[PDB]
Amino acid sequence: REWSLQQQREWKNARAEQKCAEALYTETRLQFDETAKHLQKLESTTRKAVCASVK
Amino acid sequence: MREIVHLQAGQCGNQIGAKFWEVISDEHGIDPTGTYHGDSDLQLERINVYYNEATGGKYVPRAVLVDLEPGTMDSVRSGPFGQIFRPDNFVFGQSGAGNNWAKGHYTEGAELVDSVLDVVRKEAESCDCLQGFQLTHSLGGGTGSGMGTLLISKIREEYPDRIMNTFSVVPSPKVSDTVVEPYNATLSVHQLVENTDETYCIDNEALYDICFRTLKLTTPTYGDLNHLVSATMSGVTTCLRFPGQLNADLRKLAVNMVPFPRLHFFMPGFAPLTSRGSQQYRALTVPELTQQMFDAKNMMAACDPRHGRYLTVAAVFRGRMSMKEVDEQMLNVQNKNSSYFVEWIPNNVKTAVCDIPPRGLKMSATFIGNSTAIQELFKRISEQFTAMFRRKAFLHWYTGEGMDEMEFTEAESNMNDLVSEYQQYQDATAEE
């Protein structure tokens, strides 16, 4: 009984640590996606400004 | 472990399914962003039926939106719950069909099926044990009826031993929102009778009558009609995703309602629909659910079962309730109106019970009826089709785009054969 309890407690701790690492990866991915969207918006605005200057 | 792949054909299909996904997203607790914000551990027990997993706890629907006019696609994508669908699942053509079944089936709708079957295969082998396919469309248009039937006839040859459900908005008897709607409806039903496993007929007359007389609404917009249709669509597949005392899947309902392979046209109904005035003046009981289900007013088709005979009946209940009173009430309603049931089948009614009711509600129920009162619809459509076909109305449009003249005659022959089969199964006797 004691051995099985200790083994499954340690397995649970390992799975929790893996879940936390995956959460950190998803947060960094979300930050990169937001930066990419902002950069695309900036590039489109600069292109429209250049065309208006030419006209 | 039983996935349902959703198919949307036409502008009508896009509107109905765009309401349907909102309703079951609210049912399973899904925000407009896509994540899960709910207060139960039971809502994620069976969520893989309609949703595919994503990263970061997101769920995306297993649905495809097929159309030839991207205006409805833009309307769906700009909606409130429009940011949940994957951007690749919108399959939009470049030229419309223009209410032409020939344009839908042969000329412009024959080049879109390659991309549509590609996306359908990608969403079909992604499932573990796929249960079947579902379609939502209307037989009065050009894209839903013209090319949706082509999609059915392709995917059923691809996947023979699966199940195919259809929600068809068959033409209204008095509205006639299109001049050539009997042409489209006849040429679509002639394919549906061979290539469809279950068909559900939905009528705007019935929806208007319910939303006017029952719910007592001043302005019945299409949002309320799509809400009613989506409530029926959600109530059909409830036992797959919510546990109950007596489960029932789409295959089981097909088994217990389809005695012969050409008799698979159903009329639906929903049970507790009450107005704001009469909400407090009514107690929620199983007799008050069965009465409202079996009332001929509450049918979602413009066909009256007092002219016909109930071949089979299915009922799906939702809520914590008593098996004794459920079986007692449905035996009682079977016994009382003894002339509205056939005599060569005992126990015409299948019953199912699911535990979990919809939100804000205590008890509910859904009725699916196979009767012979559906041949009235086919007789009316056939008489209008043969009303135009002797004077050869509108026929150059269909003939100049690749159709022979024998197609219309064989559609007439198949439709007349189906209505004569329905008549003989109504008039059949016990002694033989």
């Binding site: - | 472990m1 489960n247 007692e328 005992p346 126990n347 299948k350």
Partner: protein, 433 residues
């Protein structure tokens, strides 16, 4: 040493298994965690573990996960072994051919493997008890080849059969006669004894007797569990006159084709109506013979009592048992066959029945369960033959069986076989020449 293996098939089998195993756990004083808070009376049902735990000797089988997953995430999630709960992916869906041919063959291997492991753990096995329903697809189809394989694998082991029959009036399906006719070859040839119950009768009992205005499947399955516990309590607990699984088969089955008894229980009364009632042995054995307390919608006054087995529990005296039998035997209302002058078997057990929290029965001192073999079953079979032939006249629903593997001659041969079974009962019950 003496032990039984439970095999529950279908959704009905799994629900009855839940209601039976809760009663067994409370009867032997085992927590839902599986540990006894602290005598080998549990050894008939529970098996010891290397962690000090008791694991049931039961196999739950189903073709869908929706009903087994409630057991897996319920209160008794720790008690059951995780590999005793066998699940398919797609259910048979009220089809005999799906459950027998196409879908059963993927899990028959796993079910026979677990059955082999349990019977290898059994140092001496009394038999298997099969809990199933005729109407459902899995219970109709998978159970047929389950018993067909078990008959080949095991020679003379006992196979008791608790089955759900369709009700004469109410039903939960349409193809129920089709699924119920085709099992009358497996339950005829590859079954040893088969008790049949139907839910409308138990609805009547719970409505009239226990004052419950709205019974549920829990309120039915608890009564079924009480019957099964009263049957097996002679094995489990010490008593004055023990009876055995082989023993009542010997004293109740006169011919190999006649193994369909009727199971009744008494007293079934509420806690308020038990407060004013003096329940003596005669007052509990008179209610078993009443047609209003039968558990099948059939009347034994049309038939002839061929054999009777009584099982008493509690503060019961053999003198008063004999006096009650003598008072029963003088009634012209109850008729016995001429070829059975002494028709009774008597078992007496010391331990009273156990009351459950949240249940509907009352705490009682004595109780009785009766297994009576009579000739009032041909009416119940013919009342279903009317429905089956009326459906089969027009070949309704029959492509849904033909296209999945089975030929159409099986319908006719099963109808003819069970028709001969119906005919045999009349010459069994006719008066001698």
């Amino acid at each position: 040493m003496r032990e039984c293996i439970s095999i529950h098939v279908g959704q009905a089998g799994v629900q009855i298994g839940n209601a039976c195993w809760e009663l067994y756990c409370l009867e032997h004083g085992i927590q839902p965690d599986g540990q006894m808070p602290s005598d080998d009376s549990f050894n008939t049902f529970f098996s010891e573990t290397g962690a000090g735990k008791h694991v049931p000797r039961a196999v739950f089988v189903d073709l869908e996960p929706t009903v087994i997953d409630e057991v897996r995430t319920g209160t008794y999630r720790q008690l059951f072994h995780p590999e005793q709960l066998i699940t398919g992916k797609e259910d048979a869906a009220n089809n005999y051919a799906r459950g027998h041919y196409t879908i059963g063959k993927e899990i028959i291997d796993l079910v026979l493997d677990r059955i082999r492991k349990l019977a290898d753990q059994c140092t001496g096995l009394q038999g298997f008890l099969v809990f199933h329903s005729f109407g459902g697809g899995t219970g109709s189809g998978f159970t047929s080849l389950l018993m067909e394989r078990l008959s080949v694998d095991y020679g003379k082991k006992s196979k008791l059969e608790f089955s759900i029959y369709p009700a004469p009036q109410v039903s939960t399906a349409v193809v129920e006669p089709y699924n119920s006719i085709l099992t009358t070859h497996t339950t005829l040839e590859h079954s040893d004894c088969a008790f049949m119950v139907d839910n409308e009768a138990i609805y009547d009992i719970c409505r009239r007797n226990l004052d419950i205005e709205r019974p549920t499947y829990t309120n039915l399955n608890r009564l079924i569990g009480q019957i099964v516990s009263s049957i097996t309590a002679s094995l489990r607990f010490d008593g004055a006159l023990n009876v055995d699984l082989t023993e009542f088969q010997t004293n109740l089955v006169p011919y190999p084709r006649i193994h369909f008894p009727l199971a009744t229980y008494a007293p079934v009364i509420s806690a308020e109506k038990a407060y004013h009632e003096q329940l003596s042995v005669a007052e509990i054995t008179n209610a078993c013979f009443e047609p209003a307390n039968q558990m099948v919608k059939c009347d034994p006054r049309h038939g002839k009592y061929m054999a009777c087995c009584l099982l008493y529990r509690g503060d019961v005296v053999p003198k008063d048992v004999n006096a009650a039998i003598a008072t029963i035997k003088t009634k012209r209302t109850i008729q016995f066959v001429d070829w059975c002058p002494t028709g009774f078997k008597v078992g007496i057990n010391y331990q009273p029945p156990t009351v459950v929290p949240g249940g509907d029965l009352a705490k009682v001192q004595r109780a009785v369960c009766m297994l009576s073999n009579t000739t009032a079953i041909a009416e119940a079979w013919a009342r279903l033959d009317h429905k089956f032939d009326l459906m089969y006249a027009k070949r309704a629903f029959v492509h849904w069986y033909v296209g999945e593997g089975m030929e159409e001659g099986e319908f006719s041969e099963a109808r003819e076989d069970m028709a001969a079974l119906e005919k045999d009962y009349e010459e069994v019950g006719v008066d001698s020449v």
